[PDB]
Write a protein that binds this ligand. Structure first.
Ligand SMILES: C/C1=C\[C@H](C)C[C@H](C)OC(=O)C[C@H](c2ccc(O)cc2)NC(=O)[C@@H](Cc2c(Br)[nH]c3ccccc23)N(C)C(=O)[C@H](C)NC(=O)[C@@H](C)C1
Ligand SMILES: Nc1ncnc2c1ncn2[C@@H]1O[C@H](COP(=O)(O)OP(=O)(O)O)[C@@H](O)[C@H]1O
Ligand SMILES: [Mg+2]
Lengths: 748, 371, 139
């Protein structure tokens, strides 16, 4: 077998996720005699059955493409990235069609202008990987064919998705021949950060939405302009946070400026005074001045041509949402409530918005039914009043966000008709915490859909390459996460039962969980129950299993916005913006899970129109050190980006391809002169058919040999054996001949 | 596809799409035929009228009600009323949409058999179900425990429910009604000299009963009050513009619900059948039934019926045990609202009767699946 | 080995005796075997020596009589040609590649040994006729 003395293996180690070892005696069927670098010697158990991951030869290590490696497993990937990053400082790397970008915190020269002119024209493999190589592969495919192109970027927001997008746009501008997309797009970033980013337990300044920039090209492929869209915004954060989280930065940037005179009308308090900001208990981010960020947000708005009249509108509405949060109900009787007399938060909310106090106080505590002929004003429980108030806050914020994006687009658009576009998606990756909740559940469902699109695109490209090389395409094996997506989204899926439990009377998180267990517990292999609890469930995702706690779900999922409360706000006359938000039914009834599932189907329609290109970003250390690579953090990030699962899917197929001359050169050391022949293709067919016994392992394409995983490492080892033995024989002959001459000299 | 939700009764038909907040089509459920020789030529004489048309024309017509006491008692007129409901008044073809149908409990089985047979054969509805009115009132009022009292035109029935289980032995049914209150109102109104004989006059009496009756909080005290004083006495305008004045009688009319002995039945009133239904339930649940009494259907709309019920049950029930009456203002429609909620649920989509199951089993399937 | 062979070998052995006690070191056993016409690998030499430890390999001394069975045991071209054709197919070998493999793979030799055997054998391109070099080192 492949395990021999003088072979190298990876052993699992808790301090650094894998450690290298050498095998001291050849294996024969329950212990291995293992050398190390950490001391010479160690004794290592085999386990009931297992062999360690076997280590690739050092010709393949440090290749520009992880799927050049003959063994594909977590140790090889982690090592190969570490040696490229630490030794050569090559941050970019490839895996299949994906570009992995490892973020140095240090700045680099490599983005500099000349290289733009160097990459342009070059086919994707002909140059070492760099973000420009993907930017060209899009620009070239757009010019070559009708289709728009998309670039898709994933990872924890620290990982540097924005820097990758920024450089992609510089590539487009500089090759295309430009005006003022780049300066404007980078000018928008502080606004979209302030209103769309959030602070999460694992990460400060997380971005809770997917943001899409459509760069527009003329029929001459000159950059016209750009268009922005936003998807998947999580509304629930506005009303509710877990411990040690904040809702969107803008509320804290607004409260931090409460002293300033233009804000004084808002009567803003200390950031933990209000009900929406205080719940996380975490007002100050370490190492940020919020008041300074407010000034940067305003100046970015001014630079995008939102006049100061509207900026004071925006902050007026946000202070409105904060004051609305403090409104507090007393129950009269178990199915009725009212607001107490002259309640100070409601009075300030009515002053800030203009709506007359009696009408808000009336509508917050009642709802209106109407048949066409008759109308009933009906009281509602204190709980329903709270759910309606929070639904009104979420509805205001979601429309304010959509409005600010419509104005940014008004600055970014330009009049010339867009001939085709290239669209660069910054999204979040797969996400798991000690505690997982409706937010994580929606993020993971979005990532399952994106991962499905990626798997189908890779499978299409590989089918086309197999048909190109005259191989049977029926060999290639397709791996389909549709069974999980059907678990989450199909009828009597998790989301559909959550929506049912919202409306069913006396609904609760316990009765929801019980409906899950009845519906799925042993019917679907992907759904599992944690043994020691009844308030949680486990979904086997693409990447990993994830426990989700039930305790949040129904409280967060509910929206219903009572139509009269909007009609009251819409009637207000004091200022332009508040009527302007709500301008254009069934949608008011929809739950947050259903609005999310619709937004994700729009995103998938937008991407399906387009040919993708992928970037992954990984954050190499937890503490922003300039080049330290922490193999624990990088392993976690590589799992969360699905790179390891991509490599698993690839390793099943034929990952490794050789051109007949390049093969023939390397293995001419093995080949015998009788086998050498006037047709190298036939020569290699003969030699290979002898060297590796089972023809199932390899295929002959028209111009390329394909090999299953490991076979190239096997050939490299037999090559090293033959060359070693030949070297030993010549060395012993030369050593003998010289010492024998010294013997003859003593004889003479 | 949104299921239809249709709620038949004596009196109004209520229909609309599932997931709507309130019913889209509401109209009194009448089939009318002309009873005079048509003299004019080119009049456009029409074989029969349905719903609002029969109300407008009514002076020319005999009005018949095809449902008495929750039983469909001539199937041709009922099939006309469904035809009018789907085609004229909702304007949606039934071959597209599941349908949900509503019935009073403890009805004859043939009423469910025929109602399903007509839905599958004559409208080709792809799937149908039949719910109990009282169960649906609990979905509408937002509960899984309570004793529902639901009284419309036709049937009055109590159904106790406890955490989502019915208690079939405790179901009670009574035939006091908006309708028998109307016939009593005519028979007492005669005592002041006003005689409403024909069916189109009965519709006037029904409108007097809606506008002017109210349930006396204490009966003999208001009888003495009306004897002593005009102050209780109030007046109304018939369609031709004559005025009529009605006195103590206007509270006397809705009281027969509390004392059926007035119309001539012996079975006790809705308070005592509510109490007797609770008493037939086992002793551990009873606190929660007293905590929730849910009223439903139009005959519980009278001003003061909620307070008269709370007082009169409290007098019957043990003194410590808190009695509460839950009378939501919408309660005339709550059987439809409950049907809307139920038809919208995802779990229910399993539970429709489907056309294949009907073709396999024949129309008896309804008894097995529905209740 | 016969008496004549034993006499020639003993004389040679005594020429390699650098201490005068009529003995060699274990570490010299391989040297004597190669000086006597054997071409053992380092592994074979250590094996016939009994895989001695460093201390006795460097300081324990053995006379001819104990050495002899080991010499016997060790004692008991086309592969050489193909082995050289490994490093070629015009019958030449780069001097750099042969130097690298002889100094970095197998039982590594010193650069000076390789220079000594290679002196005068490379042409202006730095190419070695390996059939001639092989005959030379086998002579
Ligand atoms: C002579 C008798 C019965 C009948 C005349 C005998 C005939 C033979 O029975 C039928 O089959 C006819 C019919 C009927 C109608 C439709 C149908 O698909 C099947 C049967 N059912 C009726 O007329 C019911 C309707 C009804 C009232 Br209100 N509440 C009820 C509560 C529950 C159930 C049903 C009802 N009805 C008025 C009676 O029973 C009356 C009160 N019964 C009597 O006075 C006694 C002395 C027996
Ligand atoms: N405000 C009201 N007060 C008293 N009775 C009413 C009122 N509105 C309707 N009704 C009566 O209630 C009956 C209709 O009840 P309803 O439950 O709506 O019928 P259905 O049984 O078809 O649902 C009719 O007798 C009608 O006259
Ligand atoms: Mg009814």
């Amino acid at each position: 077998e492949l395990y021999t003395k003088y072979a190298r293996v990876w052993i699992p180690d808790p301090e650094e996720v894998w450690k290298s070892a050498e095998l001291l005696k050849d294996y024969k069927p329950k212990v291995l005699q293992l050398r190390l670098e950490e001391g010479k010697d160690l004794e290592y158990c085999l386990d009931p059955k297992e062999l360690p991951p076997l280590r690739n030869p050092d010709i393949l290590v440090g290749e520009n493409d992880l799927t050049a490696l003959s063994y594909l497993h977590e140790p090889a990937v982690l090592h190969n990235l570490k040696v490229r990053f630490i030794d050569s400082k090559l941050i970019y790397t490839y895996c299949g069609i994906v570009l992995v970008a490892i973020n140095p915190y240090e700045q680099l020269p490599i983005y500099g202008e000349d290289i733009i002119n160097a990459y342009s024209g070059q086919n994707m493999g002909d140059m070492d990987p760099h973000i420009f190589a993907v930017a060209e592969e899009a620009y070239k495919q757009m010019a070559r064919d009708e289709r728009n192109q998309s670039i898709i970027v994933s990872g924890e927001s620290g990982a540097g998705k924005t820097v990758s997008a920024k450089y992609a746009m510089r590539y487009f501008a500089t090759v295309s021949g430009s005006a003022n997309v780049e300066e404007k797009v980078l000018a928008s970033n502080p606004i979209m950060e302030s209103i769309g980013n959030a602070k999460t337990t694992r990460n400060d300044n997380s971005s809770r939405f997917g943001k899409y920039i459509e760069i527009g090209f003329d029929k001459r492929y000159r950059i016209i302009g750009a268009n922005m869209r936003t998807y998947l915004l999580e509304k629930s954060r506005v009303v509710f946070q877990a411990e040690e989280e904040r809702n969107y930065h803008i509320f804290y940037q607004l409260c931090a400026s409460a002293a300033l005179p233009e804000f004084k009308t808002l009567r803003l308090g200390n950031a933990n005074y209000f009900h929406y900001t205080k719940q996380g208990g975490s007002p100050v981010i370490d190492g940020i001045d919020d008041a300074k960020e407010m000034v940067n947000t305003r100046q970015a708005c001014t630079l995008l041509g939102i006049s100061d009249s509207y900026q004071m509108g925006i902050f007026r509405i946000l202070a409105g949402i904060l004051h609305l949060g403090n409104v507090e109900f007393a129950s009269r009787d178990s199915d009725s409530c009212a607001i107490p007399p002259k309640h100070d938060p409601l009075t300030i909310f009515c002053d800030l918005m203009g709506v007359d106090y009696e009408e808000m106080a009336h509508w917050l505590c009642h709802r209106k039914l109407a048949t066409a002929t008759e109308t009933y004003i009906k009281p509602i429980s204190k709980l329903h009043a709270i759910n309606a108030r929070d639904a009104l806050a979420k509805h205001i914020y979601a429309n304010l966000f959509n409005w600010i994006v419509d104005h940014v687009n008004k600055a970014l658009h330009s009049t010339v008709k867009q001939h085709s576009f290239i669209g660069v998606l910054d999204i979040y990756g797969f996400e798991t915490f000690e505690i997982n909740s409706f937010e994580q559940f929606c993020i993971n469902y979005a990532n399952e859909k994106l991962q499905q699109q990626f798997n189908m695109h890779v499978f299409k490209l590989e089918q086309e390459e197999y048909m190109k090389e005259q191989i049977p395409w029926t060999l290639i094996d397709f791996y389909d996460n549709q069974p999980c997506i059907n678990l989450i989204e199909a009828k009597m899926g998790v989301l559909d039962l959550l929506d049912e439990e919202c409306k069913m009377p006396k609904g609760s998180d316990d009765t929801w969980a019980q409906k899950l267990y009845n519906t799925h517990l042993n019917k679907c292999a992907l759904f599992e129950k944690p043994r020691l609890s009844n308030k949680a469930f486990i979904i086997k995702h693409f990447a990993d299993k994830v426990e989700y706690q039930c305790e949040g779900f129904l409280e967060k999922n509910k929206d219903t916005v009572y139509e009269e409360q909007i009609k009251v706000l819409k009637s207000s006359k004091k200022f332009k913006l508040l009527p302007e938000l709500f301008q254009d039914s069934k949608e008011h009834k929809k739950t947050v899970g259903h609005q999310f599932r619709n937004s994700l189907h729009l995103l998938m329609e937008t991407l399906n129109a387009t040919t993708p290109h992928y970037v992954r970003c990984i954050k190499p250390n937890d503490f922003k050190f300039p080049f330290t690579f922490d193999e624990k953090r990088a392993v976690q990030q590589l799992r969360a980006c699905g790179v390891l699962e991509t490599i698993r899917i690839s390793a099943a197929g034929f990952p490794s391809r050789w051109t007949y001359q390049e093969f023939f050169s390397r293995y001419r050391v093995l080949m015998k002169q009788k086998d050498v022949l006037s047709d190298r293709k036939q020569t290699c067919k003969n030699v290979l058919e002898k060297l590796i016994l089972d023809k199932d392992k390899y295929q002959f394409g028209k111009t390329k040999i394909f090999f299953r995983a490991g076979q190239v490492a096997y050939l490299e080892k037999i090559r090293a054996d033959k060359l070693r033995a030949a070297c030993i024989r010549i060395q012993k002959t030369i050593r003998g001949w010289l010492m024998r001459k010294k013997y003859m000299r003593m004889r003479r | 596809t949104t299921a239809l939700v249709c709620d038949n009764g004596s009196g109004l038909v209520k229909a609309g799409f599932a997931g709507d907040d309130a019913p889209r089509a509401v109209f009194p459920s009448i089939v009318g035929r002309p009873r005079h020789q048509g003299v004019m030529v080119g009049m456009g004489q029409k074989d029969s009228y349905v719903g609002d048309e029969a109300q407008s024309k009514r002076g020319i017509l005999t009005l018949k009600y095809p449902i008495e006491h929750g039983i469909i008692t001539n199937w041709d007129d009922m099939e006309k009323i469904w035809h009018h409901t789907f085609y004229n008044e909702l304007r949606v073809a039934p071959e597209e949409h599941p349908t949900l149908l509503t019935e009073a409990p403890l009805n004859p089985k043939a009423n469910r058999e025929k109602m399903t047979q007509i839905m599958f054969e004559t409208f080709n509805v792809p799937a149908m179900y039949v719910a109990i009115q009282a169960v649906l009132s609990l979905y509408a009022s937002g509960r899984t425990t309570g004793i529902v009292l639901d009284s419309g035109d036709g049937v009055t029935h109590n159904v106790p429910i406890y955490e989502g289980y019915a208690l079939p032995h405790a179901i009670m049914r009574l035939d006091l009604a908006g309708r028998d209150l109307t016939d009593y109102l005519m028979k007492i109104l005669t005592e002041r000299g006003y005689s409403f004989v024909t069916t189109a006059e009965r519709e006037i009496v029904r409108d007097i009963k809606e506008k002017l009756c109210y349930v006396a909080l204490d009966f003999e005290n208001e009888m003495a009050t009306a004897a002593s004083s005009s102050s209780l006495e109030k007046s109304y305008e018939l369609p031709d513009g004559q005025v009529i004045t009605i006195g103590n009688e206007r509270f006397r009319c809705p009281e027969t619900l509390f004392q059926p002995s007035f119309i001539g039945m012996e079975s006790a009133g809705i308070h005592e059948t509510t109490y007797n239904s609770i008493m037939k339930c086992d002793i551990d649940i009873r606190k929660d039934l007293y905590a929730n009494n849910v009223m439903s259907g139009g005959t519980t709309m009278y001003p003061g019926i909620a307070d008269r019920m709370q007082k009169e049950i409290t007098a019957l029930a043990p003194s410590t045990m808190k009695i509460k009456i839950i009378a939501p203002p919408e309660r005339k429609y709550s059987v439809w609202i409950g049907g809307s909620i139920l038809a919208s649920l995802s779990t229910f989509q399993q539970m429709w009767i489907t056309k294949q199951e009907y073709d396999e089993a024949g129309p008896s399937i309804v008894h097995r699946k529905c209740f | 080995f016969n008496k004549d062979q034993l006499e020639e070998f003993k004389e040679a052995f005594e020429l390699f005796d650098r201490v005068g006690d009529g003995k060699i070191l274990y570490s010299q056993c391989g040297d004597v075997m190669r000086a006597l016409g054997q071409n053992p690998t380092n592994a074979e030499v250590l094996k016939v020596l009994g895989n001695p430890k460093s201390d006795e390999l460097k300081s324990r001394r053995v006379d001819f009589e104990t050495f002899l069975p080991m010499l016997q045991a060790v004692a008991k071209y086309e592969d050489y040609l193909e082995g050289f054709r490994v490093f070629d197919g015009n019958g030449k070998v780069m001097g750099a590649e042969l130097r690298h493999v002889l100094t970095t793979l197998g039982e590594k030799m010193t650069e000076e040994e390789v220079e000594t055997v290679l002196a005068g054998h490379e042409d202006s391109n730095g190419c070695i006729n390996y059939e001639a070099f092989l005959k030379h080192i086998l002579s």
